[PDB]
Ligand binder design. Structure first.
Ligand SMILES: *[C@H]1O[C@H](CO)[C@@H](O[C@@H]2O[C@H](CO)[C@@H](O[C@@H]3O[C@H](CO[C@H]4O[C@H](CO)[C@@H](O)[C@H](O)[C@@H]4O)[C@@H](O)[C@H](O[C@@H]4O[C@H](CO)[C@@H](O)[C@H](O)[C@@H]4O)[C@@H]3O)[C@H](O)[C@H]2NC(C)=O)[C@H](O)[C@H]1NC(C)=O
Ligand SMILES: *[C@@H]1O[C@H](CO)[C@@H](O[C@@H]2O[C@H](CO)[C@@H](O)[C@H](O)[C@H]2NC(C)=O)[C@H](O)[C@H]1NC(C)=O
Ligand SMILES: *[C@@H]1O[C@H](CO)[C@@H](O[C@@H]2O[C@H](CO)[C@@H](O)[C@H](O)[C@H]2NC(C)=O)[C@H](O)[C@H]1NC(C)=O
Ligand SMILES: *[C@H]1O[C@H](CO)[C@@H](O)[C@H](O)[C@H]1NC(C)=O
Length: 427
């Protein structure tokens, strides 16, 4: 079957090459995302663990940003080899909340037959864009990956969050596609909203050395979505111990201050016997942020010193920016570690400076891109990108979800690709 990337997988190519040895296969049609002309599919989540996956999206009628929310899909299922010997996703269980207008920022963790999905519940829109008026309310659903006919609360049911420990943070919420379980406590990528006049930051920790026109205040102002924001954002994890009587709390853990950046969508995952953490770059530090997790609680991450991977921005903080500016921009494009011995990772990235376009599956190390494969056209518009890799017959496969703009219908939709990591550098 399909299993996590653990133990001693088949060899992969380790050399920088321009040979086309990556051969992505399009596998969207196994999920309900091929879509209908007058509908936009937005706000996707994909998560994978132990032969299962959780998937979520919102469908809007008309406009992609201001359209009417038709339905929120939350499904789980299994990753299975089609006869082809190629992995693909198959739903087994799907749920829709009663009110699709109010669910935001879902995040999934798998544990022993069930996926847990933590979401924000808001009556004032995306909580990030109006945080003062957001109530801070949360919701968690449990889905069985193996539905059992008329299974009452086994198949689906919601859990009650009657206690949130958030220390000195006003509000706390899930903020990233997926997390990890730890026999058997759950950890969700999350973010904390700290009242700005409580943020202890020493401006003399802001790298201005040969950054022309970069005031040392910039690193503190950029910790909120706006230089005058009431809150600043701090990434971290939400802990949820399943073995806590009957009302397990949720405890916020903040990310350490090494290479601090405004809280943004993040991800924690298990690769080869140890957890990795990825944090999207939504401000001035535009080089990819991920690394082995030194310790989970408290959270400290051994950020890689990657010099080749970045992400497109706008005028102020374009791709490859490293100088402290005041900005809130960027895109979520994560990377999955596939070989620790050599620290090689795979991800889909947008190969452009100031426009979100040209999605390229790329395998890479800290200072070298080894090889790559265009996923669409060089002026294809794209956004969020979520990669998970695993084993199929001891061979490493990755599955990437990529938000692509469809020029026919003028709407975005998730495309799924399955990519085998080449076991040799010649075709
Ligand atoms: C995120 O969160 C909150 C929602 O809780 C939102 O605040 C609300 O925003 C709307 C503005 O879009 C505002 O409604 C407008 O209010 C003014 C009257 O202003 C004052 O009246 C209230 C009565 O007690 C008082 O409580 C406050 O002092 C309030 O400031 C009104 O002039 C507007 O009407 C406009 O003109 C035409 C008239 O025909 C309307 O038909 C049309 O709808 C117009 O918008 C409008 O009603 C509302 O009062 C705010 N709610 C409160 C509690 O403050 C934030 O705006 C939002 N923040 C972000 C970044 O999105
Ligand atoms: C990346 O570079 C730093 C500095 O050379 C390495 O050492 C520590 O890294 C962390 C992460 O940014 C810093 O917060 C510490 O101050 C560094 N300690 C020092 C000065 O030795 C780090 O190990 C490198 N990461 C990699 C790729 O292993
Ligand atoms: C996209 O942005 C990058 C970063 O500024 C540009 O690449 C740099 O181009 C300058 C030209 O002065 C070189 O000195 C640097 O070495 C480049 N940085 C690296 C290592 O990539 C790039 O040219 C931009 N794309 C364009 C031309 O629009
Ligand atoms: C950090 O440095 C700045 C400037 O020297 C200072 O304001 C601050 O007090 C220092 N650290 C602390 C908390 O003492």
């Amino acid at each position: 079957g399909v299993s996590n990337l653990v133990g001693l997988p088949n060899n992969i190519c380790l050399q920088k090459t321009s040979n086309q040895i990556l051969k992505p296969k399009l596998i969207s049609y196994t999920l309900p995302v091929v879509g209908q002309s007058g509908t936009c599919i937005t706000d996707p989540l994909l998560a994978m663990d132990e032969g299962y996956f959780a998937y979520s999206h919102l469908e809007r009628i008309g406009s992609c940003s201001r359209g009417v929310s038709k339905q929120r899909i939350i499904g789980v299922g299994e990753v299975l080899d089609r006869g082809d010997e190629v992995p693909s996703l198959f739903m087994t269980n799907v749920w829709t909340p009663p009110n699709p207008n109010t669910v935001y920022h879902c995040s999934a963790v798998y544990n022993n037959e069930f996926y847990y999905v933590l979401c924000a519940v808001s009556t004032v829109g995306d909580p990030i864009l109006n945080s003062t008026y957001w109530s801070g309310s949360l919701m968690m659903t449990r889905l069985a990956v193996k539905p059992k006919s008329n299974g009452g609360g086994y198949n689906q049911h919601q859990l009650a969050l009657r206690s949130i420990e958030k220390g000195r943070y006003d509000k706390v919420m899930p903020y990233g596609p997926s997390g990890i379980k730890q026999g058997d406590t759950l950890y969700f990528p999350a973010v904390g909203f700290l009242v700005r006049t409580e943020f202890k930051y020493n401006d003399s920790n802001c790298p201005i050395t040969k950054c022309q026109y970069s005031k040392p205040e910039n690193c503190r102002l950029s910790m909120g979505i706006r230089p005058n924001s009431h809150y600043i954002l701090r990434s971290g994890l939400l802990k949820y111990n399943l073995s806590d009587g009957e009302n397990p709390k949720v405890v916020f853990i903040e990310i350490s201050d090494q290479r601090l950046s405004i809280g943004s969508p993040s991800k924690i995952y298990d690769s080869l016997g140890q957890p990795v953490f990825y944090q999207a770059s939504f401000s001035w530090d535009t080089m990819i942020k991920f690394g082995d997790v030194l310790t989970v609680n408290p959270l400290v991450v051994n950020w890689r010193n990657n010099t080749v991977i970045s992400r497109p921005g706008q005028s102020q903080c374009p791709r490859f920016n490293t100088c402290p500016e005041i900005c809130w921009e960027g895109v979520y494009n994560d990377a999955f570690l596939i070989d620790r011995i050599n620290w090689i990772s795979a991800g889909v990235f947008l190969d452009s400076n100031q426009t979100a376009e040209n999605p390229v599956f790329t395998v890479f190390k800290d200072n070298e891109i080894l090889y790559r494969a265009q996923l669409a056209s060089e002026d294809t518009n794209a956004q969020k990108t979520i990669t998970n890799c695993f084993l199929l017959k001891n061979k490493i496969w990755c599955i990437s979800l990529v938000e692509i703009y469809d020029t026919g219908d003028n709407v975005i939709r998730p495309k799924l690709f399955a990519v085998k990591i080449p076991e040799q550098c010649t075709a």
